[PDB]
Each structure stands twice: as C-alpha cells, then as structure tokens.
Design a protein around this ligand. Structure first.
Ligand SMILES: NC(N)=NCCC[C@H](NC(=O)COCC(c1ccccc1)c1ccccc1)C(=O)O
Lengths: 231, 338, 56, 274, 205
C-alpha cells in the first residue's frame, strides 16, 4: 500500500538545525513531486517547499527561503537551519504528480511534530465554524483575491479534509473533480473567485476542518480552515 | 453427400445475389446527384507529434478528443496531449512487434498487441503512480491485428489466425469466438452502440458479427484484394472498407450490398486506414502512396489531400467531436490536421 | 471432416439468406438525410473559425 | 585591372551558385530530414558555406572601394574575422567528413557501438571552437591606416600565416588524402571490388576540388611572406591575392553539389521539394 | 499554472525516449528464415508469436528473430523486419520449397538492399545421402559428376541464381552442425554488411 512515513522531529533549541526525512513506499517515488506542508498547533495548513520529479524545479515559501533546503533510497529530506519559534508545527510530506488529468496532493504523510523552545494570492474562508447535524446538507465557501480560472479553462481550487487526529485528505481537486475513494456525496462548484463545497447527507465521518487551497501559482496558499462539528 | 452440400451452397449464394439485386432499384449516385458538392477541403497541419523513433503502426483517440495513444515498433506506447504536444505517458512494451493499440472509452486502459500473439492491457490509473500491465490476453495462435474496447471489462480482438475473439479482462478468457473468415482478420471496428462489429479479413470479405450471440449476420464481398481498413458510418447503418485493390467501398447493412466505390485511375497504392467525418459526409483514407485522400462519401469525388508524410500512412483517426483528424506514418511522425 | 465444414457453411448461408432487405434507394436517402441533419455540427467540411479551434 | 575583374566575376558566380545551393541544402537537411550522424556534418558544413555566401557581398564592396575603408575599426576587425572563421570551419568540417568516412570503413564495430548524433555534435562544436581560435588573431591584428583610410594588417604576421598554412592546409590535406586512399584500398577486396572505381572517382574529384580551391591561397600567402610589398612583384601578389581568396571562397558554393548531392535520398528529397 | 510541471515531465520522458533509442540503435538485428526443421533451431541453440534470441560476439550485440511459428501469410507482417541488418537463411542439404521461399524473400520490395547470409547445414548428412542416393532426384536438370563437392556447388549456385539486385550480396557457408564457428561466420558477414551500409549512407558506394 502507498505509505509516507516521516521522522526527525523533537524538542529543538532555538537557532539550531534539524533534518526531516520522508521515507516512501508502495508507489513510484521518482515520478512524483514532493511537498512539505506544516501545521501550527493553533493554526491551519501552510505550504513550505516543493521539489519536482527529477529535482529540476524547487520552490520555497517566503518565510522559509534561505533557511530551509529540500532534497530527495525513495526518500525526501527537509534540511532546516536557523530555526525560529514560529517553526513549531507538525510537518507533512505530500506526493503531487503532475500531468493532464492527474490528481495532485492526493496522499499525505502521518506527520512529524517538531517543537522549538505581498503579492501572494489570499485564500479567505469567511466562516470558521458551523454547527451541523447528521443527515443534513452543509455548504462551505471560500474566496480568492485573484481569479483562479486560467486561460486553459482549468480553475485551480483544491479541497482538503482533516479529521481530528488524522492527516489531511484530498477531497476535490481543481474545484470540480472528485478524488479517488471520496464518497459521491461531496460536490465542488465555483466561478472564478467564489468557491463552495457542498455535502449531501452528512455522516459522522465527515466531521473535521475543511481547507481550500489554490494551485494557480506558487507559493501555494490555504484558507483559514472551516470546522464542522457534530450537533 | 459432399457434392450435394456444395451444390446447396452454390444455389444459396446465387439466391443471396439475386435477393441483393432485387433491392437495387437505384444507386447512391443517382440519389445524391442533385445535392451540392462539398467543394475543395483544405486541412492544414496543426500539430506534429515527435516522440517515436521507428515506424508508427497504430494510433487511437481518446473519448475526450484530446488524448491519443500511438504504437511504434521502437517498443513504446506513447500517450499524447494533442492540445499541448505534451507526452503524458510512455509505456515500454515487452514485445516491440506491435501492430495495434486501443484506448478505453473510460480512459483508464490502453490495449496493445502484435506479433507476440498477445493482447496486453495497461492500467493508466494505478494508485502506485506508473503504468503497469494489468492483463495479458493469450488465446490467439496468430498475430493480433486489431483490438477495440467495449467497456472496462471486455475487449474484441481480430487476429491473423483468421478469427475474432471477445474477452473478459478480469478472467482473461475468450467469452466468445468469431469464426468464418478464411484469411487473416486484418481490421476491426465496433458500432456506436457496441452491440455489433464489422471485420475485414484477407479473404477479400467483410463480416457483420454481433457480440451477444457470437454469430455472423451478413457477409460483404465486393473487393478484389485483402481488406486492410474498416469503419462504420456515424449512424451505424453503413460502413466503409479499404483494400489493397486501391479502392474504398461503402456498404449498407440494411441493403446488404455495396453503395459506392471510391477510386481514381492514378491511385495504385493500397489503403492502410479509413475513417469517417463526424457527419459521415467526408471519408478519409490513408494510402501506401504516402498521402491521405478526402472523399465525398455521398458523391464519390476527391475533396482534398492530406500531403505531408514522408512514408506510408499507417493509421488515421477522427476525434469524437469532429474537430481534428490524426494521421500516423512509417516516417515515425503523428500529424494533426484540421 | 469436410462434411461438417460444408454443413456449417450451408447453414450459415441459409441464415444469411433469411435477412429482410430494404430498397437501396431508401438506404441512400437515409444516409443523405443523416448527413444533412448533422452537417452544421461537423467541423471538417465547414472550416471552424480560429476562435473555436482548440488547435489554433 | 584584369585581376580585379576576374576576382569580381568569380565572387559573383560563387554568390549566384552558392545562395541557391546552400539555401536548398540547409532547408532540405535541417527541416525536411531527421537528425542522423551523416546529417549533422552536412548541417554544419552548409551553415559555414552559407555564412560564407552571405559574406561575398562584403568582399565585392571591398574590391569596388579599391582599398578604401570609410567604415570604423570594429567592422574592419569583424567582417574578415567572420569570413575566415566560416572558411576554415568549412575546411575542418571537410576533414571531419573524411575522418568519419575512414572511421566507419575501418572501425565498423566501434562505430556500431559508439557513433551517434551526440558525438557528431560534440566534434562539430569543437571544430567551431577551433575556428574561433583560428580567427582570433584576425580580429586582434586588423587595423585601419590613415592618402585614404584602408584596411590592412599591422614578426607576428609570420607566425599567424605559418600556423594558418599548416593547420588549415597540410594536416587537413594529408588527413583527407590518407583517409580516401585507405577507403579506396579497402574497396579492393570482397563485394566492393565492383564499385571501387566509382568510389575512387568520387574521392579523387572531391580531393582535387579542395586542392584547386585552397592551394593558391596558401602559395600566395607564403610568397607574400617571402616578398616585401615595396619590392617588385609585390604589387602582382597583392593584385592576385583577391582572386585567390575568391577561389578559396568558391569551395563554399562547390561543397553542396560535392557532398550533399551525391546522396540518393538527398537528391530525391531536394527534387521533391523543388 | 501547473502545466509547467507537465511540460517538465514530458521533457523528462522525451529524454528517456532518446536514451532508449541510442541504446537500441547499437544492436544488430537479423531476420532468421528458412523452411521447417532446416537447422534454424540448431544454429540459434549453438550460440509463441516471435522468438528473439540475443547474444554478444566480439563487442556486437546480435538480435535474432525467428518467425517460423507465425502460421499465416508473411505478406502482412514481413515489412516489420524491413530494417534488419541482414537475413539468415537456413537450408538442410539432406532433404524446392526452400528455393521458392528464398526467391520470394530475396526479391521482396522491402528487402532490395538487405543482404542474406546463407547457411547450408547438415553437410555430413548430405554427403551420406549422396553416397546412398544420387542428387539428380531433387534437381532433374543436374548434369555432372555425383560427388559431394560438385553437388554442393550446384546447390549453392541454384540459390544464388535467385538474386537479381546488384546492391545486395549473398554470403554462403556450409556447416555440418558439428561446429561452433557459426558465430564467427555471422560476425565476418555482418562486419562486411555494416561497412557496405555505412559507405552507402555516406554516398561513397
Ligand atoms: N591570400 C592569402 N594567402 N591570404 C590573404 C589573407 C586573407 C585573410 N582574410 C580573408 O580571407 C577574408 O577576407 C579578406 C579580405 C576582406 C576585407 C574586408 C572585407 C571582406 C574581406 C578580402 C579582400 C578581397 C577579396 C577577398 C577577401 C586574412 O586577412 O588573413
């Protein structure tokens, strides 16, 4: 089965260095691009770095560039230097193959908890929490400062579901396409800058935090995170 | 009693010929003589797909009219993004002697076969990333000349062992066999409703099979040499064939005989491929004389030429929406015309 | 050997000879009507402008 | 001045016979044919010959000016440098033609295992680098002397002309003659005895054309070394240099017919294209 | 937006395609023909659709294709071997059909410039058969002494009479199947063939 196990986290003195690893199994690691995504204990998802398939292209976040390094034995590395107190997060490893019709960001790792003692597209989710009961219909919406619709007709909005205690799971990719294994109850629609995620016949397994992510241009940005809680 | 059976066969053939002649009240030319000709059809090359290194033998379009698969004897099955020229997948084959390739209408599988006597199924939507061999169909004692998907689970193959087979991909067994041809079954096409298919073999004949019962409904013999290409009309009530006799012919299913012949005096090379336009008004055929001729299917007049290949035009397909036509060739190049 | 093959051949010929056949003029008219009804939506005989051509 | 008229007409016929031939060869080989090892050499040779073809108008203007240069120093250092680069690149590419032919004849196993488009591209790039190094002294030492301003060279001249003579004539000539002699000698036995005469004729014609085009350049170069310009017979050497350079440049228009147009596939493709 | 990554992937697999082509162009491909039980298996063993055998001799990789199992007409797929370096043809001397097969292959439109390496296997068995029965049975128009050498020479001439193309050569070797020199003979013939093909590609032949 496809696996992504991460290691190397722990208590870190400020200003030090630590190396994160992402051991891959169950899939062709060489043909996938890898991402690092971190989540602060009180915040949501935050894209960190990306290395392409073949190591030809590498990207970093603005608060990450110059201090972190991404490299890829079927393993991916995250060499981090000069760590600050703002780096305390659970770090995730993501496989993101890219071709026509493909589904990027489909698998996420288990996460490694590490603790330390301007022109970007803004993804805003107006509602942070909504009360909902099983069997009803709930809609979660978010907006983007810049239009996500491209000249080729693809609009790059991604939906992620994070259940309590588990890693994020891809639900909708490119704002209309249902990810493999996701129940048909999930539906995504939008128009340019406004996007909504509609769920029909809510179940107990759909309780969590919903993140919408744009892939139109680097750096990749997430929404604030809308949480649906039972009752 | 062998002589009696031979005489019965001869009189049955004579009865079939007389019955077909009884329904020939007027010809297609006499019916379409009064309609306006299509005029000169000028198709230009829009894309040229440069990945292959040996002769391309087969190509097939996706149902999305954007993705296409191609087969070359360099050992690779290449999946192309026609809009961007981008190569989506490259599949290395166990046997390089491929002569056919098919694309599943769902878009999750591609078929492949040739001189190894095997139809191989390739999964395009594996969870592990890369493309893997999902199935290898092995029941034919002769080379696989064509294969076409009916759905994700069943596929029909024509073979040089003078037979056609219907398979179940899950079990890998021949659900039905189609026998009756006396030469190499060289071409294959399935009807728009996928309930029946026509095949053209080297016995200069074409047969109409149905997948459900596995029997031959009608036999069409008008050609003089081996039929190399075959294609249904968009309505499913007619089909066209291409032979080594340097002619194309149109056959009606409900009239049980030939309607038109497409040929010219200075056309000597055999036809390798044949396809229809979206409306059926245009019949496009590939030739060994390095070109592709556009025919007016209702008037049997040449309407244009697709020149621009340096070797034999091996394969040709029209997209489902009718926006473009692809031609593959022995010069190892795939061209998109529009 | 050959007797069974001949019996199968004559049976197949009898089956093929027992198919109802319409007039050829009717079939030609049906083909012509199909081509006429779908003429407007066929992009190959009518050159589509570059605005609607995904291969422009 | 009969020498000046002769040089002008030779440059003119070279121009009118080389623009069509080289343009056709370049178009056919670089757009209507695929990249093979044999095709890369022809591509680079036709590039060199065509930039030679685009350069003869400058030589015609130089002759028409009768030793007068109203232009700046940069053009005087640049145009002859490019011309020399292209001519000697053509010479080195001809030597590479002969070397590759001898190599495929005498090392068939090695060429089966190690001869491809990449190695041909690498050797062509090395040839271009060598040609640039050869023309560097031309760019450095050309100046303008001010009756009227004229282009002319400023001990260093001896080294430049001797190195030019050796590296651009003797080694290429010896290599070509030896390679073609070995190919002919190889053609003696086996299946090749019946086509040895044809191969011999082709080799003799190409070597003789190269020699007649490129020798008088070198002989009048060494005589210009030996004879001072002020001494008698210096004016004659200066006058006929022009025509000898014209002969040297005529190899550019001759090369397409001699190399690309002996290929049956190339002939068929060109006839189809025209 | 993310079409850049798809372009990168397309370029990567184009690079892989080029590397594969360079690796594949080094092989010497040989079409292995002849009648049934003609010694084809014997020579491919001394060193169901299509059988490919690969071996290396003096730094050449040889790819041998046997098409005897294709029990259908050759005219539909014989063009799949148009680009082979040479054709191996096996004849059992101790055995008309072979002559017609050689005539059809030799004068095929796809094999005009393709050279044929002709093997005359079972030399000792042929000598024993001559000692037992005359060779005039197979060829009615054979006039001459009934010795081994002259009969073998006559058969060799009968095969080479089937060639009309001057741009191709026939390399005939006689084997007794009690030998291991066949790889060497193929090597010498293929070296000669590659020299000829390279010379033709350079325009000097
Ligand atoms: N004869 C001999 N042994 N070598 C003599 C030197 C030759 C060489 N230069 C060249 O070959 C290139 O052109 C030289 C020259 C020229 C000057 C300005 C513009 C364009 C061309 C030119 C004059 C007139 C007819 C043709 C060319 C060198 O500068 O060393």
């Amino acid at each position: 089965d496809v696996q992504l196990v991460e290691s190397g986290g722990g208590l870190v003195q400020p200003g030090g260095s630590r190396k994160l690893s992402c051991s891959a199994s169950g899939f062709a690691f060489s043909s996938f691009g890898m991402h690092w995504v971190r989540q602060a204990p009180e915040k949501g998802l935050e894209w960190v770095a990306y290395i392409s398939s073949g190591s030809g292209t590498i990207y970093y976040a603005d608060t990450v560039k110059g201090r972190f390094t991404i490299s890829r034995k079927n393993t991916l590395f995250l060499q981090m230097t000069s760590l600050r107190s703002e780096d305390t997060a659970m770090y995730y490893c993501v496989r993101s193959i890219y071709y026509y019709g493909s589904s990027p960001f489909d698998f996420w790792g288990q996460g490694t908890t590490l603790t330390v003692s301007g022109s970007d597209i803004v993804m805003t989710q107006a509602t942070s929490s909504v009360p909902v009961t099983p069997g009803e219909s709930v809609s979660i919406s978010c907006r983007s400062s810049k239009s996500l619709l491209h000249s080729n007709g693809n609009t790059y909005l991604y939906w992620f579901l994070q259940r309590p205690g588990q890693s994020p799971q891809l639900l909708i990719y490119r704002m209309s396409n249902l990810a493999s294994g996701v129940p048909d109850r999930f539906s995504g629609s939008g128009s340019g800058t406004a996007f909504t995620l509609t769920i029909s016949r809510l179940e107990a397994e759909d309780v969590g935090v919903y993140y919408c992510m744009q892939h139109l241009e680097y750096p990749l940005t997430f929404g604030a995170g809308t949480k649906l809680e039972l009752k | 009693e062998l002589d009696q059976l031979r005489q019965e066969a001869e009189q049955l053939k004579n009865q079939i010929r007389d019955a077909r002649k009884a329904c020939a009240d007027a010809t297609l030319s006499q019916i379409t003589n009064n309609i306006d000709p299509v005029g000169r059809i000028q198709m230009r090359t829009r894309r040229t797909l440069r990945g292959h290194l040996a002769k391309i033998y087969a190509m097939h379009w996706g149902t999305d009219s954007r993705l296409l698969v191609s087969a070359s004897q360099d050992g690779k099955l290449i999946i192309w993004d026609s809009y961007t020229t981008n190569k989506v997948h490259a599949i290395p084959l166990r046997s390089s002697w491929v002569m056919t390739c098919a694309y599943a209408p769902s878009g999750n599988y591609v078929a492949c076969g040739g001189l190894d006597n095997i139809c191989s199924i390739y999964n395009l939507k594996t969870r592990e990333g890369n493309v893997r061999v999902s199935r290898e169909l092995a029941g034919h004692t002769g080379y696989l000349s064509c294969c076409r998907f009916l759905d994700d689970n069943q596929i029909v193959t024509s073979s040089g062992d003078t037979t056609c087979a219907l398979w179940d991909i899950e079990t890998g067994q021949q659900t039905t066999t189609f026998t009756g041809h006396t030469g190499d079954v060289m071409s294959l096409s399935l009807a728009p409703d996928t309930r029946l298919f026509v095949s053209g073999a080297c016995d200069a004949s074409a047969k109409l099979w149905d997948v459900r019962e596995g029997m031959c409904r009608q036999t069409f013999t008008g050609h003089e040499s081996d039929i190399n290409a075959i294609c249904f009309f968009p309505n499913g009530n007619a089909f066209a064939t291409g032979s080594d006799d340097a002619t194309c012919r149109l056959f009606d299913l409900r009239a049980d005989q030939e309607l038109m012949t497409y040929s010219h005096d200075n056309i000597i090379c055999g036809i390798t491929s044949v396809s229809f336009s979206k409306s059926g008004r245009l019949l496009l055929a590939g030739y060994d004389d390095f070109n592709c001729n556009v025919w007016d299917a209702l008037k049997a007049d040449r309407a244009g030429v697709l020149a621009g290949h340096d070797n034999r035009v091996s394969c040709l397909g029209v997209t489902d929406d009718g926006m473009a036509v692809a031609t593959g060739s022995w010069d190892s190049f795939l061209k998109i015309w529009n | 050997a050959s007797i069974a093959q001949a019996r199968k051949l004559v049976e197949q010929l009898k089956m093929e000879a027992n198919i109802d056949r319409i007039k050829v003029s009717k079939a030609a008219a049906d083909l012509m009507a199909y081509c006429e009804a779908h003429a407007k939506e066929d992009p190959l005989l009518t050159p589509v402008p570059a605005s609607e051509n995904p291969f422009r | 001045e009969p020498p000046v008229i002769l040089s002008m007409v030779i440059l003119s016929l070279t121009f009118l016979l080389g623009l069509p031939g080289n343009g056709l060869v370049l178009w056919v080989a670089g757009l209507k044919m695929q990249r093979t090892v044999n095709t890369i050499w022809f591509l680079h040779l036709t590039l060199a010959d065509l930039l030679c073809c685009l350069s003869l108008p400058f030589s015609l203007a130089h002759l028409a000016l009768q030793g007068q240069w109203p232009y700046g120093r940069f053009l005087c250092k640049l145009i002859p440098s490019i011309i020399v680069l292209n001519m000697f690149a053509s010479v080195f590419l001809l030597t590479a033609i002969s070397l590759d032919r001898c190599l495929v004849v005498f090392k068939p196993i090695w060429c089966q295992n190690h001869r491809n488009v990449g190695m041909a591209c690498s050797i062509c790039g090395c040839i271009w680098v060598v040609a640039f190094v050869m023309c560097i002294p031309v760019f450095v030492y050309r100046e303008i002397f001010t009756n009227h301003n004229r282009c002319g060279y400023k001990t260093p001249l001896v080294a430049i002309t001797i190195t030019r003579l050796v590296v651009g004539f003797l080694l290429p000539s010896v290599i070509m003659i030896a390679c073609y002699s070995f190919i002919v000698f190889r053609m003696q036995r086996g299946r090749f005895a019946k086509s040895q005469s044809k191969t011999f004729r082709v080799a003799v014609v190409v070597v003789a054309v190269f020699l007649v085009c490129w020798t008088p350049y070198h002989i009048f170069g060494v005589l210009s070394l030996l004879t001072d310009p002020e001494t008698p017979l210096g004016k004659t050497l200066m006058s006929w240099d022009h025509v000898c350079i014209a002969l040297a440049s005529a190899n550019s228009c001759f090369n397409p017919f001699l190399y690309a147009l002996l290929g049956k596939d190339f002939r068929k493709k060109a006839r189809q294209s025209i | 937006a993310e079409e850049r990554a798809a372009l990168e992937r397309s370029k990567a697999i184009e690079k892989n395609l080029k590397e594969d082509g360079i690796s594949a162009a080094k092989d010497v491909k040989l079409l292995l023909l002849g009648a049934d039980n003609s010694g084809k298996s014997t020579i491919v063993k001394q060193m169901t659709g299509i059988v490919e055998t690969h071996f290396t001799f003096k730094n050449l990789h040889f790819r041998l294709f046997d098409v005897g199992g294709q029990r259908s007409e050759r005219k539909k797929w014989i063009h799949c071997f148009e680009d082979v370096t040479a054709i191996i043809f096996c004849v059992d001397l101790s055995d008309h059909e072979s002559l017609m097969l050689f005539d059809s292959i030799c004068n095929n439109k796809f094999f005009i410039d393709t050279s044929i390496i002709l093997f005359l296997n079972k030399k000792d068995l042929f000598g024993e058969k001559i000692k037992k029965s005359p060779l005039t049975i197979c060829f009615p128009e054979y006039t001459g002494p009934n010795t081994y050498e002259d009969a073998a020479a006559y058969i060799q001439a009968q095969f080479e009479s089937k060639n009309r193309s001057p741009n191709k050569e026939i390399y005939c070797h006689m084997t007794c199947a009690t030998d291991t020199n066949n790889a060497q003979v193929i090597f010498d013939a293929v070296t000669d063939i590659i020299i000829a093909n390279n010379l033709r590609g350079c325009g000097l032949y």
